[PDB]
């Protein structure tokens, strides 16, 4: 019944977004455990998180049934110009924080490759090293913006 995006198959690595307010602007890494088959009673996918667990002692990685629209492929590998790109004020970035990626905007660049990032939904202003940031991309119409 539903035509899944081609990247979505059992075993596929994905980034997972949540509908919950406390996760606004985040992408958590995970993998697909199950998808609707052409033979199916659901329209949903089950995913397993890579860095979130059911329990704080860490015995079982968290699994969730999610909407297809909550998933996208892993962000594109950082290119060669993108390693040459300086991060600048105004840039849309994701910051690695609490073991997932959170979208924000660079508001200040300091020396020694450090920056301050504003997060609109949480009204937070947080400093990061360059190696904690990635340039933000969007998965739209089956392709990345900006493209690969």
């Amino acid at each position: 019944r539903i035509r899944l995006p081609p990247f979505l198959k059992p075993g596929a690595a994905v980034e997972i977004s949540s509908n919950e307010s406390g996760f606004r602007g985040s992408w958590y890494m995970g993998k697909v455990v199950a998808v609707p088959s052409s033979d199916s009673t659901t329209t949903k996918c089950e995913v397993e998180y890579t860095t979130l667990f059911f329990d704080k002692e860490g015995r079982k990685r968290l699994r969730e049934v999610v909407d297809v629209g909550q998933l996208r492929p892993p962000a594109p590998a950082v290119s060669e110009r993108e390693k040459r790109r300086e991060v600048a004020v105004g840039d849309d970035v994701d910051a690695f924080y609490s073991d997932g990626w959170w979208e924000g905007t660079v508001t200040e660049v300091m020396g020694d490759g450090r920056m301050s990032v504003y997060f609109r939904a949480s009204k937070e202003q947080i400093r990061f090293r360059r190696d904690e940031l990635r340039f933000h991309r969007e998965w739209v119409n089956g392709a990345w913006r900006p493209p690969i």
Binding site: R24, L52, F53, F54, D55, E57, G58, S98, E124
Partner: peptide
Amino acid sequence: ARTKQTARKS
């Protein structure tokens, strides 16, 4: 280990 409870911001 990280859980939704210790990752979420609200």
